[PDB]
Design a protein around this ligand. Structure first.
Ligand SMILES: *[C@@H]1O[C@H](CO)[C@@H](O[C@@H]2O[C@H](CO)[C@@H](O[C@@H]3O[C@H](CO[C@H]4O[C@H](CO[C@H]5O[C@H](CO)[C@@H](O)[C@H](O)[C@@H]5O)[C@@H](O)[C@H](O[C@H]5O[C@H](CO)[C@@H](O)[C@H](O)[C@@H]5O)[C@@H]4O)[C@@H](O)[C@H](O[C@H]4O[C@H](CO)[C@@H](O)[C@H](O)[C@@H]4O[C@H]4O[C@H](CO)[C@@H](O)[C@H](O)[C@@H]4O)[C@@H]3O)[C@H](O)[C@H]2NC(C)=O)[C@H](O)[C@H]1NC(C)=O
Ligand SMILES: *[C@@H]1O[C@H](CO)[C@@H](O[C@@H]2O[C@H](CO)[C@@H](O[C@@H]3O[C@H](CO)[C@@H](O)[C@H](O)[C@@H]3O)[C@H](O)[C@H]2NC(C)=O)[C@H](O)[C@H]1NC(C)=O
Ligand SMILES: *[C@@H]1O[C@H](CO)[C@@H](O[C@@H]2O[C@H](CO)[C@@H](O[C@@H]3O[C@H](CO)[C@@H](O)[C@H](O)[C@@H]3O)[C@H](O)[C@H]2NC(C)=O)[C@H](O)[C@H]1NC(C)=O
Ligand SMILES: CC(C)CCC[C@@H](C)[C@H]1CC[C@H]2[C@@H]3CC=C4C[C@@H](OC(=O)CCC(=O)O)CC[C@]4(C)[C@H]3CC[C@]12C
Ligand SMILES: CC(C)CCC[C@@H](C)[C@H]1CC[C@H]2[C@@H]3CC=C4C[C@@H](OC(=O)CCC(=O)O)CC[C@]4(C)[C@H]3CC[C@]12C
Ligand SMILES: CC(C)CCC[C@@H](C)[C@H]1CC[C@H]2[C@@H]3CC=C4C[C@@H](OC(=O)CCC(=O)O)CC[C@]4(C)[C@H]3CC[C@]12C
Ligand SMILES: CC(C)CCC[C@@H](C)[C@H]1CC[C@H]2[C@@H]3CC=C4C[C@@H](OC(=O)CCC(=O)O)CC[C@]4(C)[C@H]3CC[C@]12C
Ligand SMILES: CC(C)CCC[C@@H](C)[C@H]1CC[C@H]2[C@@H]3CC=C4C[C@@H](OC(=O)CCC(=O)O)CC[C@]4(C)[C@H]3CC[C@]12C
Ligand SMILES: CC(C)CCC[C@@H](C)[C@H]1CC[C@H]2[C@@H]3CC=C4C[C@@H](OC(=O)CCC(=O)O)CC[C@]4(C)[C@H]3CC[C@]12C
Ligand SMILES: CC(C)CCC[C@@H](C)[C@H]1CC[C@H]2[C@@H]3CC=C4C[C@@H](OC(=O)CCC(=O)O)CC[C@]4(C)[C@H]3CC[C@]12C
Ligand SMILES: CC(C)CCC[C@@H](C)[C@H]1CC[C@H]2[C@@H]3CC=C4C[C@@H](OC(=O)CCC(=O)O)CC[C@]4(C)[C@H]3CC[C@]12C
Ligand SMILES: CC(C)CCC[C@@H](C)[C@H]1CC[C@H]2[C@@H]3CC=C4C[C@@H](OC(=O)CCC(=O)O)CC[C@]4(C)[C@H]3CC[C@]12C
Ligand SMILES: CCOC(=O)c1ncn2c1CN(C)C(=O)c1cc(F)ccc1-2
Lengths: 231, 116, 106, 298, 226, 51, 114
């Protein structure tokens, strides 16, 4: 009953195009992702598939309702209205979100701003593949995301306490490699428009033809048995 | 939550009609079960009715001997037996499905005695 | 037809002691076992639904654990009033109940 | 004007309906009921380890605000009506690339009973992921799962329960198994609870069982192996004086073994460990070397 | 398109492109008949609200007399009207069905002839005198391995279907024939030194018993799978 | 050896020759040329075999 | 992105993946030089209506040096500005063209020396 009133009050006099705090210090988006599975990795195409659950949080002074209701969950039908930060993956070749039944998106608005926005993804990234280090080869596959339309003066990312998780490492379907390590770095990149804060999470992999060359050499050496037979 | 008819005494060969009234919720949401209990033995399942569509199932051993009909308007489920022998002298219960299909609400139970 | 074998048949335990019951299920029942308590000359009540889930209003000592085909109830500190009958019954299919266990204090 | 009464009823029904709020926000939790009717079980793939499945994913929940008093008592509303009312979000925890058909008009029927009970069904084409264990190839009997749970609503707000008794919920069609390699056995369903960083979410589960057929591989690889071994054991009955004949006889058996093993091992999907056919092929391949070295020492 | 009328008769026509799926049975491949279907039905309305029927059973489907397939050939198409009952109601269904029959002359020469040639060449070995044993040994070995290689090479160009066919049973039969011939010669070569008349009889009996059994097997095969 | 060489070359040629072209019912104007190559080479082989 | 300015200078950016088509002459395979290109033009506005020009001719295209193909190598790229005439009018055009050269050393050992 009253939640409809609260929503109608929040949406009155609300402008979608403008990020919060346009004239003052920039918004500070916290980021936290959960890796579900890592698709097949191939050396020819030089690419790999990942499936994550991207989640990011930011304060917002205009969503400051006051009532007894502490927290209000929301379906994905609300994401279109309130502001949502653009965040693309620089390493992506082909990225698609999931809408199996409905749009997979979540929205949680706490009592004093602090929107929460999470959504499923599926990313294909270019992994710089090197093979001379074998048997000691350790490939590193990067995944680096950053804002697109906002310079460093207008948006800044930052990780949470842990902010990266994994699960069910046995069922990641990757054969030739094996998951070993995981790290996280933040940088600043200059481009045509200005300066963009570029988050970066890249985790390492290790490796564990030779079964096909043997049948050829075997037949070669075996054909020579003819020679020592009498003429 | 649930009420049933009073104690019943009937001669063999006749048919008795039992009732379970649900007060506080419309039965058309959930199912309704019927369970009997002989003296000093384990529970035994009888049937299952769906007041939304009227569908019914029965324990293959009680099939043809029991009939379950419901009155959605008066909010009550009725259990009408067939010609009953002197064997089935036991208490009957009515239940409502819970969360995980566990029959949570039970009636006080009525005692049907077959005497002469 | 699914059959539910319950063991032991009847056991007696002193006050404040640990008590454990078992309900072996011949066929498959995927964690839909439900334990019912029946005091003498009353109506059965629901203790545990599913597995390791307590119905509301149930004391903290009643705890159960479940598997694919093996199910176990674990009472904590048994009291004076906890003496009653205990029935395990699966509802995966057309439901059927176990034989029943009577627990008299000593 | 026979439609004006129904249009007035419906417009009064949608008067001030807020689709962002689930039915009974401050009251009891919403209890969605689910049911699947698998129309056809698609081609299971060993390479990608995905299996295509077709479903008529049915749903039903009791919404209190949509109650009405009218003559028909069952409104068979169109497909466009489904977007304006609340519709629970139900994703697939392990489905890579699903697709909902849009053939000639969105495939969604929405039935509203007089009480307020809704019905809502789609015609999806699910493409899930099931990890396989090829340790018993080609005699393996592995089970591919399918997990669907609510999203954006914790367990304190939406709870899934199977529409009918769980044994008879997930139904497969009689002649729908457009499947060639494997053979279908049955279904297995199991409720559950999965705790995560956000909260505790309810998660239904379905297991489809599969057993590979061996009749093809019997006449494909095993029987040629057995024939080749029996043929390589024939050399002992040849005369010991005709040396070149026995030499050629022994060498050509190894040649046949190499050809057969190369032809057979190609179809096997890539794995880290060694499959159960590899041991048979290795022993079948070592006995001919044994016979050859025996002839050599003779 | 949309085309109204004075009496309210709408006419709605799309232009679609369906990649339907029809169960194909390849047990009798190469020479087989396939019946593929296309089932049309409503989705949101039961049989109480909508009705389907072809608008003229003779001219409900046109253009089938002109369709040309590179490999198959149309034989006959039928039109059906049914009523299907699911768990929610009784839905109306319409069906389009037309059998498919493959061409014959192209695949038979490509596939079957080599095995028959290998079996006949394995037969060629019997006439050779038992004195030059090495020659017939070499022939009985080369036939086996050539047959195995022919089988392995043929199992690639054919469509990869993981269940049993007829051509595979045929190839395995020929493999069994050549293997039995080689075992027969091994037996003859071992038993000859004790008794010459046994082998001198077995040669002339086998020369006439192999082709008879082979032709009988082929007659049964081509009577049952044609 | 000579005949085996010719036969293997002819077969490996015919495979790709008919692979580059679709699979139609009738015989193309290249199937006849391939079949004449084929008939001459196997006639030479049968001649060798009978000699 | 959309970026306004105090003087009204709008700035419109995209992120595109183009599977463009270039003609390859292979008469000199594998010792050849390829000229693959990318041609850009307006569509609804004639040359009396809109004008294209590279901004910062020296720095119009960036990031070419970091490009490394597995088989080719980017020798040189040039910039062009033209006016093309069709049947309906005169439309402006910009062009981007960069040569491609093969790594002969990968083919020498594998093909020629046998
Ligand atoms: C050149 O032309 C082509 C085609 O002519 C253009 O492609 C089209 O581009 C437009 C512009 O974005 C798209 O419209 C919008 O699409 C998004 C996302 O689309 C996803 O779902 C698509 C299907 O849409 C739904 O409806 C069907 C109906 O059955 C459902 O089954 C689905 O579940 C969906 O809910 C699906 O087809 C898309 O897949 C394709 O696109 C992606 C992205 O490009 C590719 O990666 C894929 O590979 C694939 O090719 C995709 O999955 C929708 O979300 C938009 O709807 C919302 O947004 C509107 C604007 O915000 C709003 O007006 C709508 O009402 C709706 O908003 C609703 O939801 C909001 C929350 O999200 C609420 O807040 C709001 O209140 C409201 O309730 C919109 O439909 C076309 O889909 C797309 N078509 C195709 C075939 O690709 C191409 O863009 C053109 N190029 C250029 C440069 O313009
Ligand atoms: C191809 O397959 C379809 C089904 O996959 C076949 O359709 C079947 O056709 C027969 C006709 O021989 C139908 O039988 C009918 O029975 C009704 C019962 O009342 C009656 O009207 C007639 O006696 C008629 O014969 C059958 O219903 C129909 N559908 C099935 C079996 O599901 C079809 O015949 C096959 N062949 C061709 C060339 O399409
Ligand atoms: C790939 O091929 C194209 C097609 O020829 C090359 O474009 C050509 O580039 C030259 C100089 O780069 C152009 O010459 C210019 O002509 C104008 C005419 O007035 C003159 O004013 C300039 O000073 C210059 O001489 C030529 O017109 C142009 N051709 C076309 C059709 O636009 C391109 O250079 C080739 N790629 C590389 C990397 O060279
Ligand atoms: C030669 C006979 C003896 C054993 C028979 C086989 C016994 C078992 C099978 C598995 C069966 O599947 C197909 C027939 C087959 C190969 C039979 C084919 C004919 C065989 C090989
Ligand atoms: C070679 C014979 C001896 C054992 C037989 C097998 C015994 C068991 C089976 C399992 C059966 O399923 C298919 C036939 C098969 C492979 C038989 C095929 C013919 C075999 C391999
Ligand atoms: C390597 C194995 C496989 C075939 C074997 C040969 C088979 C025939 C002969 C001829 C014989 O005279 C001497 C042994 C030798 C070389 C054998 C040596 C060991 C060989 C080369
Ligand atoms: C397929 C190729 C390989 C062997 C060729 C066959 C070799 C022998 C003959 C017998 C000859 O008489 C007719 C051509 C034919 C069938 C050839 C047809 C084309 C074949 C089957
Ligand atoms: C290459 C394989 C596939 C077909 C096989 C041919 C099938 C038929 C014959 C005819 C036969 O006489 C000699 C073997 C040969 C050429 C085979 C040689 C090996 C071939 C060419
Ligand atoms: C070769 C033998 C072993 C299995 C037999 C087959 C077993 C089954 C059938 C299906 C039957 O229909 C026709 C006979 C046939 C081909 C038999 C033909 C003779 C075969 C191929
Ligand atoms: C057909 C194969 C399988 C068994 C073989 C037979 C095994 C025993 C003999 C007896 C022998 O004297 C002549 C060959 C013959 C008929 C073989 C002919 C070829 C046969 C009939
Ligand atoms: C060459 C002559 C000697 C034996 C004759 C064969 C004896 C038996 C038969 C089986 C008969 O059936 C067809 C004729 C044939 C092949 C004859 C063909 C002509 C043959 C091969
Ligand atoms: C070329 C191959 C295929 C058929 C083989 C022939 C099959 C039969 C004989 C008869 C035999 O006596 C001598 C070997 C020879 C010519 C073979 C020689 C090698 C040949 C010609
Ligand atoms: C670490 C941030 O995590 C998310 O942002 C997130 N977003 C959605 N969910 C999660 C948690 N998570 C790892 C799940 O798998 C899950 C499972 C559910 F059943 C329902 C929701 C989620």
């Amino acid at each position: 009953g009253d939640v409809t009133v609260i929503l109608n009050n929040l949406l009155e006099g609300y402008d979608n195009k403008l990020r919060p705090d346009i004239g003052v210090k920039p918004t500070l988006i916290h980021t936290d992702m959960y890796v579900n599975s890592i698709g097949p990795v191939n050396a020819i195409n030089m690419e790999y598939t990942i499936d994550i659950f991207f989640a990011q949080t930011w304060y917002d002074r205009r969503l400051k309702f006051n009532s007894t209701i502490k927290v209000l969950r929301l379906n994905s039908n609300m994401v279109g209205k309130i502001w949502i930060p653009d965040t693309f993956f620089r390493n992506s070749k082909k990225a698609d979100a999931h809408w199996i039944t409905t749009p997979n998106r979540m929205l949680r608005i706490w009592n004093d701003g602090r929107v929460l926005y999470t959504l499923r993804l599926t990313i294909d990234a270019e992994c710089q593949l090197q093979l001379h280090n074998f048997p000691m080869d350790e490939h590193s596959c990067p995944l680096e995301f950053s804002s697109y339309g906002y310079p460093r003066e207008e948006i800044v990312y930052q990780w949470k306490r842990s902010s990266v998780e994994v699960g069910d490492t046995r069922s990641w379907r990757l054969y030739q490699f094996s998951f070993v390590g995981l790290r996280n770095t933040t940088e600043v990149v200059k481009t045509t428009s200005g300066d963009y804060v570029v988050m970066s999470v890249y985790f390492d992999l290790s490796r564990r033809t030779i079964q096909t060359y043997i049948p050829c050499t075997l037949i070669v050496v075996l054909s020579w048995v003819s020679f020592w037979i009498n003429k | 939550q649930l009420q049933q008819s009073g104690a019943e005494l009937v001669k063999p060969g006749a048919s008795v009609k039992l009732s379970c009234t649900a007060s506080g919720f419309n039965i058309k949401d959930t199912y309704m079960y019927w369970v009997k209990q002989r003296p000093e033995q384990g529970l035994e399942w009888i049937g299952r009715i769906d007041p939304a569509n009227g569908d019914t199932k029965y324990d293959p051993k009680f099939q043809g001997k029991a009939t379950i009909t419901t009155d959605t308007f008066s909010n009550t489920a009725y259990l009408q037996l067939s010609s009953l022998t002197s064997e089935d002298t036991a208490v009957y219960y009515c239940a409502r499905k819970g969360l995980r299909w566990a029959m949570d609400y039970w009636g006080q139970g009525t005692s049907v005695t077959v005497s002469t | 037809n699914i059959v539910m074998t319950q063991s032991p048949k009847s056991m007696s335990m002193s006050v404040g002691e640990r008590v454990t019951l078992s309900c072996k299920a011949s066929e498959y029942v995927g964690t839909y076992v439900s334990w019912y308590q029946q005091k003498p000359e009353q109506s059965p009540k629901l203790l545990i639904y599913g597995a390791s889930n307590r119905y509301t209003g149930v004391p903290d000592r009643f705890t159960g654990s479940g598997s694919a085909t093996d199910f176990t109830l674990t009472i904590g500190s048994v009291q004076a009033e906890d003496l009653a009958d205990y029935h395990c019954g699966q509802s995966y299919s057309y439901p059927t109940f176990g034989a029943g266990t009577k627990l008299e204090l000593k | 004007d026979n439609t004006t009464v129904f249009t007035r009823i419906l417009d009064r029904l949608l008067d001030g309906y807020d689709n962002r709020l689930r039915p009974g926000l401050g009251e009891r939790v919403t209890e969605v009921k689910t049911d699947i009717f698998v129309t056809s079980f698609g081609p299971v793939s060993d390479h990608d380890m995905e299996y295509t499945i077709d479903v008529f994913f049915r749903q039903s929940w009791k919404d209190e605000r949509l109650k009405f008093k009218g003559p028909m008592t069952v409104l068979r509303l169109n497909n466009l009506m489904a977007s304006k009312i609340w519709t629970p979000d139900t994703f697939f925890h392990n489905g890579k690339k699903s697709v909902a058909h849009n053939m000639t008009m969105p495939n969604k029927l929405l039935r509203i009973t007089e009480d307020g009970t809704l019905l809502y069904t789609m015609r999806l084409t699910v493409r899930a992921e099931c990890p396989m264990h090829l340790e018993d190839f080609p005699m393996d009997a592995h089970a591919c799962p399918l997990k669907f749970g609510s999203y954006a609503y914790t367990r304190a707000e939406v709870v899934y329960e199977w529409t009918r008794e769980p044994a008879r919920s997930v139904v497969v069609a009689e002649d729908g198994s457009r499947l060639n390699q494997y053979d279908l056995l049955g279904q297995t369903v199991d409720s559950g609870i999965v705790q995560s960083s956000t909260g505790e979410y309810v998660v239904m589960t379905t297991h489809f069982h599969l057993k590979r057929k061996i009749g093809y591989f019997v006449i494909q690889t095993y029987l040629p192996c057995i024939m080749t071994v029996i043929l390589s054991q024939v050399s002992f009955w040849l005369n010991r004086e005709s040396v070149p004949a026995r030499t050629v006889f022994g060498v050509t058996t190894v040649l046949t073994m190499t050809t057969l093993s190369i032809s057979a091992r190609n179809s096997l999907p890539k794995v880290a460990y060694a499959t159960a056919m590899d041991w048979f092929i290795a022993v079948c391949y070592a006995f001919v070397f044994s016979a050859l070295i025996e002839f050599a020492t003779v | 398109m949309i085309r109204l009328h004075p009496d309210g008769t709408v006419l709605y026509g799309l232009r679609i492109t369906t990649t339907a799926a029809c169960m194909m049975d390849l047990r009798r491949y190469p020479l087989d008949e396939q019946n593929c279907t296309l089932e049309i039905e409503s989705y949101g309305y039961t049989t109480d609200d909508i009705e389907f029927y072809w608008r003229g059973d003779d001219n409900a489907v046109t253009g089938v007399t002109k369709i040309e397939l590179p490999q198959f050939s149309i034989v006959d198409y039928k039109l059906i009207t049914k009523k299907v009952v699911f768990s929610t109601g009784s839905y109306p269904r319409l069906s389009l069905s037309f059998k498919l029959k493959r061409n014959i002359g192209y695949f038979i020469l490509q596939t079957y002839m080599p095995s028959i040639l290998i079996t006949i060449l394995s037969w060629v070995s019997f006439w050779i005198n038992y004195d030059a044993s090495a020659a017939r040994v070499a022939l009985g070995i080369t036939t086996v391995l050539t047959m195995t290689t022919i089988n392995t090479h043929l199992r690639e160009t054919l469509p990869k279907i993981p269940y049993v066919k007829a051509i595979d049973m045929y190839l395995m039969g020929c493999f069994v024939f050549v293997f039995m011939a080689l075992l027969e010669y091994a037996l003859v070569n071992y038993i000859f030194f004790s008794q010459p008349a046994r082998a001198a009889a077995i040669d002339r009996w086998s020369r006439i018993f192999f082709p008879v059994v082979f032709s009988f097997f082929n007659i049964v095969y081509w009577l049952y799978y044609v």
